Chain A
Amino acid sequence: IVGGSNAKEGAWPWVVGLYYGGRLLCGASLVSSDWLVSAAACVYGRNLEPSKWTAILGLHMKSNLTSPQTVPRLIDEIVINPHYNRRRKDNAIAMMHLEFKVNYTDYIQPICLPEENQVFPPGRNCSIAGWGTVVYQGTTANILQEADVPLLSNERCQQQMPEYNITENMICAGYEEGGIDSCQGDAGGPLMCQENNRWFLAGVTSFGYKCALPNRPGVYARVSRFTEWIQSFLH
Chain B
Amino acid sequence: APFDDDDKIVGGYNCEENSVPYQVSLNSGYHFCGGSLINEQWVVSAGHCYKSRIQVRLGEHNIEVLEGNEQFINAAKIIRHPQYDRKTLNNDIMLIKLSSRAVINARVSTISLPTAPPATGTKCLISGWGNTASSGADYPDELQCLDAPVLSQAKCEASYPGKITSNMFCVGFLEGGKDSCQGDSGGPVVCNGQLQGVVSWGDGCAQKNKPGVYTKVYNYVKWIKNTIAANS
A and B touch in the complex (CB under 8 A): yes
Q: Give me the interface of A with B, judged by CB distance under 8 Å.
A: 21-25, 63, 137-140
Q: Is B121 an interface residue (CB 8 A)?
A: no
Q: Which are the 10 A-B pairs with shortest beta-carbon distances?
A: A23-B15, A23-B14, A24-B15, A138-B142, A140-B16, A139-B65, A22-B19, A138-B141, A140-B15, A138-B140
Q: How far is the CB of B65 from chain A (nearest CB, A)?
A: 6
Residues of A within 8 Å of B219, CB to CB, are: none
**Residue from B17, B18, B19, B142 with most neighbouring chain A CB atoms (10 Å):** B18
List residues of chain B with CB under 8 Å of any chain A CB: 14-19, 62, 65, 106, 140-142
- B10 CB to closest chain A CB (Å) equals 13
**A24 CA to B106 CA in the complex, in Å?**
18
What B residues does A24 contact at CB under 8 A? Answer: 15
Q: Which chain A residues lie closer than 8 Å to B65 at the CB level?
A: 139
Nearest A residue to B14 via CB reads: A23
- Rounded to whole Å, the gap between the CB of B131 and the closest CB of chain A is 14
Q: Report chain B residues within 8 Å CB of A25.
A: 15
CB distance from A26 to the nearest CB of B (A): 11
Total A-B pairs in contact (CB under 8 Å)? 21
Residue on A with the closest CB to B107?
A63
B13 to chain A minimum Cβ distance, whole angstroms, is 9
A40 vs B140: C-alpha distance when bound (angstroms): 27
Within the assembled complex, what's the spacing in Å between the Cα atoms of A21 and B65? 26
In the complex, chain B residues whose CB is within 8 Å of the CB of A137: 140
A-B contacts besides A21-B14, A138-B16, A140-B15, 17 pairs, CB < 8 Å:
A22-B15, A22-B19, A23-B14, A23-B15, A23-B17, A23-B18, A24-B15, A25-B15, A63-B18, A63-B106, A137-B140, A138-B62, A138-B141, A138-B142, A139-B62, A139-B65, A140-B16
Q: How far is the CA of A138 from the CA of B63 in the complex (A)?
A: 12
- B-side contacts of A138, CB under 8 Å: 16, 62, 140-142
Instruction: With both chains docked as a complex, state the minimum distance between the C-beta of A221 and any C-beta of chain B, in angstroms.
Output: 23
A54 to chain B, nearest CB (A): 12
Complex CA gap A140/B140 in Å reads 13
By a CB distance below 8 angstroms, the chain B residues around A140 are 15-16
Q: Complex formed: what's the CA distance from A140 to B106 in Å?
A: 18
- Provide the residues of chain A in CB contact with B19, threshold 8 Å: 22
Q: Tell me the smallest distance from the CB of B205 to a CB of chain A, in Å.
A: 21
Q: Give CA–CA (A63, B16) in the complex, Å.
A: 13
Nearest CB on B from A1, distance (A): 15
CB closest residue in chain B, given A22: B19
Inter-chain CA distance A140–B17, complex, in Å, is 11
Shortest Cβ distance from residue A22 to the other chain B in the assembled complex, whole angstroms: 6
Which A residues touch B141, using CB under 8 A?
A: 138
User: In whole Å, how far is B206's beta carbon from the nearest beta carbon of chain A?
Assistant: 21
Q: Nearest chain B CB to A217's CB is how many angstroms away?
A: 22
Assembly CA distance A170 to B142 (angstroms): 33
User: Can you list 21 A-B contacts (CB < 8 A)?
Assistant: A21-B14, A22-B15, A22-B19, A23-B14, A23-B15, A23-B17, A23-B18, A24-B15, A25-B15, A63-B18, A63-B106, A137-B140, A138-B16, A138-B62, A138-B140, A138-B141, A138-B142, A139-B62, A139-B65, A140-B15, A140-B16
In the bound complex, CA of A27 to CA of B62 (Å)? 24
